[PDB]
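G., before I forget:
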Amino acid sequence: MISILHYGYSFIMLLGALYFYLLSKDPKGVPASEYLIAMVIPLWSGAAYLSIALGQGLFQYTTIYYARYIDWVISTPLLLAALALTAMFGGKKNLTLLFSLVALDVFMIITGFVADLSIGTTKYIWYSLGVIALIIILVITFGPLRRIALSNGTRLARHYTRVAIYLSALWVCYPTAWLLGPSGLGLAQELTEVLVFIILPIFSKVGFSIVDLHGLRKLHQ
Amino acid sequence: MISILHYGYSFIMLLGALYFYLLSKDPKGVPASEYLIAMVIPLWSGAAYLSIALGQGLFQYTTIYYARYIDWVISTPLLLAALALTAMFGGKKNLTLLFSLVALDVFMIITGFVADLSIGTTKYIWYSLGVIALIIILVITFGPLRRIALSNGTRLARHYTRVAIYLSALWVCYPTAWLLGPSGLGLAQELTEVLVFIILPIFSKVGFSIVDLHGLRKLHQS
Amino acid sequence: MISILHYGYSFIMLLGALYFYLLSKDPKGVPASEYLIAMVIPLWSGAAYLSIALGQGLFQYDDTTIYYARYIDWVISTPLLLAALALTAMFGGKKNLTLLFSLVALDVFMIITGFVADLSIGTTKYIWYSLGVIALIIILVITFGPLRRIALSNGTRLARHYTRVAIYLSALWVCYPTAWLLGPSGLGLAQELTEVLVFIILPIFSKVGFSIVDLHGLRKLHQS
Ligand SMILES: CCCCCCCC/C=C/CCCCCCCC(=O)OC[C@H](O)CO
Ligand SMILES: CCCCCCCC/C=C/CCCCCCCC(=O)O
Ligand SMILES: CCCCCCCC/C=C\CCCCCCCC(=O)O
Ligand code: NA
Ligand code: NA
Ligand code: NA
């Protein structure tokens, strides 16, 4: 079941990528960079998840689905880049703030991987550092980044706020599932966690970009 | 023999690097970035191949020359960057298209590594995904990227087209040799593969940049 | 003692990071990028050194202990330090990102040769070490040659500051390959504990010290 679920995930990522490619061909005032980011996220995630489907992206240590971290260490900084470019749509870019989010995010995913490789108190030290990174990401998202979105007009700010809540709601689920699952307290079953880390990312990756791109395109007319 | 051949490769990379450094001192309207890229490619490749010569960049799994993938994952995106900056010479840059090529290329090399670590059907799934990335790279090269080259005038477009064909011809040899060699169908002997992945990269790396830089320098006024 | 020393290091990195954050809130004409770089260096290093403190960022190889977390630290922290140095030289003028990325490329190569040298034995070790030293020399040639000339093109006051930070960085950085060669990873003249203290004290000056000196100098160029 776990293999088939991952094949399914990868096929959905492939379909998402193709949809974003088709949209890119009639861009409606949205820059090519946004479409490129939208395509890389699912294609890379699809590849990583394909490795799990093929029985490669995991080892016994509990099962570590290490391919998930290879996925997220690329896909999640690109998602924050997407979020940051949305806030900045129609205005001056702040690449300093954007790379601040990328740095926090890459650190967050790494602490997760290290936490998964750790045992006892050490595991939760790393996990806790990852959660602290996420909180700071959310502080930036609803603080200075949102203020940039507001500086770019009511219609853009409305859209940014929607995508900001969408992203934030999904992202807090990841460390919650991690803590509950085999990598953490072990209250939730492996199969339950596998389904969560199949369904969440479909919404976090393809869902997010459908909502993000459609909203930005709608600002054209 | 395999060790000595790799020492030779590294010495040629070193010579190439120094030649590009000397050219950079009298740039003839070619930007420093092009000279930097031209030097990094062979220096990094030389280092990677030196590790093979010293017996470090390979393990038994059949022999995997993993240092080749460490080489290519840096050297091949830089080569496409070089190609893209050539198309854009004299005009506005399209870094989106450039990073599209970098992303495709890094994926291509990784699928190769994963394919080399795989057995049976799984190997050829990864290989096939790598080939699909290469096809898209070539489609970009002769499609949108060439159209940018054409927007920058007759003489630049002529040069870009030459370098584009040079690169494309060499690059399709890599997945061909891979499939024929021990990593694939195993028709070719290890020594045969080692020689191909010594001679190809000399032309793909040092050869390419001699052709690319000389062509751009020839466009210089006064 | 080695664990406690690393905990101490990480706490000092954390304090440095917070100080640079507070400075960033009243920037005095210094761009946000400089403050971001100043914070990333110690935070990343603190993380890497925390792994050593917890007993994770090291393994036994050739009977010697390899502190592999130091290389994970440096491969990110040292290119960011040269970026900081390069942006100082370019302060008030056109940027040269080609020269900046030249330094980043040399630096990342340097740290990798170090790691490979640490994993190597006999002549092979010193081939890698030697390539790393050659990278450092070229970095220093850039620092006192073309990069300094960019600093001079941005006026007397900036060039004076750049030269100070350039000497500060250079003096600290030549110590790293010296300690490495003398210590367990090299000739084995110096004891593990000696090396551990060197690679605790040097980086406090190389990371937090450097940025205090760099940022204070740039801020002092502001007229309020
Ligand atoms: C094993 C893998 C190792 C990978 C190693 C990765 C190193 C990360 C750092 C790179 C240098 C950062 C470059 C900084 C670019 C300069 C920023 C700039 O242009 O500044 C503009 C201005 O200062 C703002 O207002
Ligand atoms: C694990 C894989 C890591 C790969 C990292 C990327 C390798 C290096 C290639 C980067 C491409 C650099 C292109 C620079 C564009 C310069 C454009 C300009 O001159 O304005
Ligand atoms: C592993 C070692 C190499 C990794 C880093 C490679 C860096 C070299 C690549 C590209 C150089 C980018 C130059 C950007 C030019 C912008 C214009 C300018 O201001 O000069
Ligand atoms: Na966006
Ligand atoms: Na070029
Ligand atoms: Na600086």
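Chain B has nine helices and two strands. Residues 190-218 of chain B form the longest helix (29 residues).

More on Monday.
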